[PDB]
């Protein structure tokens, strides 16, 4: 499911970031970085969900997990 992040999507993200030329290994590097980020955030969110005993991870679990990292997000009930 990590191959669902296609090369055009990474190209689009780099173009919105202002990148003009892209190497060929950037895609795998970005997939690794994204996997690490998502692993940490989802681990925190599932920890919160386990404390809550809920059958879903809620948006509140994600918002508190991002506040835990310092990535405060507005517009999801915070």
């Amino acid at each position: 499911n990590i191959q669902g992040i296609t090369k055009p999507a990474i190209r689009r993200l780099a173009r919105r970031g202002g990148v003009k030329r892209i190497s060929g290994l950037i895609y795998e590097e970005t997939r690794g970085v994204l996997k690490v980020f998502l692993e940490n955030v989802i681990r925190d969110a599932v920890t919160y969900t386990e404390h809550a005993k809920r059958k879903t991870v809620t948006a509140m679990d994600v918002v508190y997990a991002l506040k835990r990292q310092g990535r405060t997000l507005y517009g999801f009930g915070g």
């Binding site: 005993k53 809920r54 059958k55 879903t56 809620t58 948006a59």
Partner: protein, 139 residues
């Protein structure tokens, strides 16, 4: 999607509690309990929907289910339709030990099992459900 289901289930919980209070007052006022019967179709339709079980467990609607199943102070049992529908819903949902702890439905289940005015089929179903719920605790 699912925040909305939780809100709707909470609204259903409030409606169920209000209907139970109204029916209890009406019985105390010399009138039959009709509000529970009126709300029964919507509760049945909501409970029969399987994908909403997770949201039901996240809102602990089993507390209101037990409140409806709790016999009124006049020592009068609830309507047989309500008991049958609630038993079917309880069978239809994956109740775990945490949900029972949140709701405390085991006490009412034991009361139903011990009681004799309860239908014998409901008695057998209560015994089966109590055994199934004791299964995970002992292994």
């Amino acid at each position: 999607l699912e925040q909305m289901q939780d809100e709707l289930i909470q609204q259903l919980k409030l409606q169920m509690e209000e209907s139970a209070i109204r029916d209890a007052n009406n019985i105390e006022q010399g009138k039959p309990a009709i509000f529970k019967l009126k709300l029964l179709p919507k509760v049945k339709d909501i409970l029969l929907r399987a994908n909403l079980a997770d949201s039901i467990l996240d809102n602990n609607l089993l507390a209101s289910v037990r409140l409806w199943l709790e016999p009124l102070p006049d020592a009068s049992l609830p309507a047989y339709q309500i008991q049958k529908v609630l038993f079917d819903a309880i069978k239809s949902l994956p109740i775990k030990t945490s949900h029972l702890r949140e709701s405390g439905l085991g006490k009412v289940m034991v009361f139903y099992q011990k009681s004799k005015r309860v239908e014998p089929n409901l008695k057998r179903t209560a015994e089966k459900l109590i055994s199934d719920w004791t299964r995970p605790i002992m292994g």
